[PDB]
């Protein structure tokens, strides 16, 4: 089998991707965001605390005749961004792209924090990461990933962003046409749970590459790139005007700039990330101040290879018995 779903980007600046998910039967379509950083699936439902929804679509796991209460089971998550959600779990069929599993755990939110209620466009998460991360008690529940991967053709799945347009997450296959040159494919270490790789190095700009190991994951959940600060000096010394503010929480540049490249390494092959991909826009609304997209993981105890980065590539999750990351450009 195979599913192929279109990501469509929440807002302006690409701050998250949404991509529709059925679930249920009949089916209820919530657009979730796929999250290679983390590892549950769960939903703005009608469990979830009134005050705490917004113009959310809600999972009703009541008018779904596929649905079962998993008895007992209970979830809680934190993620990075402090933002957190916690509920009781279903299982019910999930389809993405007309990739359909039977049995998934759905985790229904009870709770959701502050920055979930806000943002209206995404009904719920699908954790793309390893299962080992999955936060379901007392019996840990496995990702829409992890129970598709026996009827995938190929047990992978690709991401596929766009820059301030829609993408494409497929299931099962690699779309030959979907990217330029060849892929390049690197070792993963899964021991923290994470699609864990480590870079070759980066330049600026035109600049030289440094040729220097970079850990970090590939976090599709992530919107910027965090790499280390002597990394992100080194960028942001080249914008003039560029500063990290501590009041505004990270780098910030002139809005008349225009930013470079940053070129990461995979192997031997190189990734550019082009200037305009690195502006996250005003701070405030009509400030001349922007937000940048490259920011420090000091602060973090991990390298993220969110969203800036996953979007400049043809980005290969492949789940096989030893796991890599593949990368071409597109």
């Known amino acids: 089998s195979t599913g192929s779903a279109t990501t469509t980007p929440i807002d302006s600046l690409d701050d998250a991707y949404i991509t529709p998910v059925q679930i249920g039967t009949p089916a209820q379509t919530l657009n979730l965001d796929f999250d290679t950083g983390s590892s549950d699936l769960w939903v703005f439902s009608s469990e979830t605390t009134a005050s705490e929804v917004d113009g959310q679509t809600i999972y009703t796991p009541s008018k779904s005749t596929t649905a079962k209460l998993l008895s007992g089971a209970t979830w809680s998550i934190s993620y990075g961004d402090g933002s957190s959600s916690s509920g ?24 959701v924090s502050s920055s979930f209620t806000e943002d209206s466009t995404i009904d719920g998460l699908l954790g793309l990461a390893f299962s080992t991360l999955n936060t379901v008690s007392p019996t840990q529940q496995k990702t829409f990933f992890d129970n598709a991967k026996a009827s995938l053709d ?10 301030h347009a829609p993408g494409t997450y497929n299931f099962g296959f690699i779309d030959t046409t979907a990217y330029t040159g060849s892929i390049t494919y690197t070792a993963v270490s899964t021991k923290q749970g ?19 190991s970079i850990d970090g994951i590939a976090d599709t959940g992530t919107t910027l790139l965090y790499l280390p600060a002597t990394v992100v000096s ?16 990270g780098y910030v ?33 009509g400030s001349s101040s ?19 980065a996953l979007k400049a590539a043809f980005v290969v999750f492949n789940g096989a018995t030893t796991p890599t990351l593949g990368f071409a450009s597109k």
Request: aromatic share 14%; hydrophobic share 35%.
């Open 194 to 212: 994470f699609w864990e790789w480590t870079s070759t190095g980066y330049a600026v700009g035109s600049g030289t590459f440094k040729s220097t």
């Open 88 to 111: 009781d779990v279903y299982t019910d069929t999930v389809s993405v792209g007309g990739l359909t599993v039977t049995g998934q755990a759905v985790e229904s939110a009870k709770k």
């Open 290 to 308: 922007c937000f940048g997209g490259i920011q420090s993981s000091a602060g973090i105890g991990i390298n993220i290879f969110g969203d800036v």
């Open 253 to 285: 540049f002139p809005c008349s700039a225009t930013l470079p490249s940053f070129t990461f390494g995979v192997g031997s092959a190189r990734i550019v990330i082009p200037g305009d991909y690195i502006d996250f826009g005003p701070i405030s609304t």
């Open 234 to 249: 080194a960028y942001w010394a080249q914008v003039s005007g560029a500063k990290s503010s501590s009041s505004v929480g």
């Open 154 to 163: 190929s047990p992978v799945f690709t991401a596929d962003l766009g820059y």
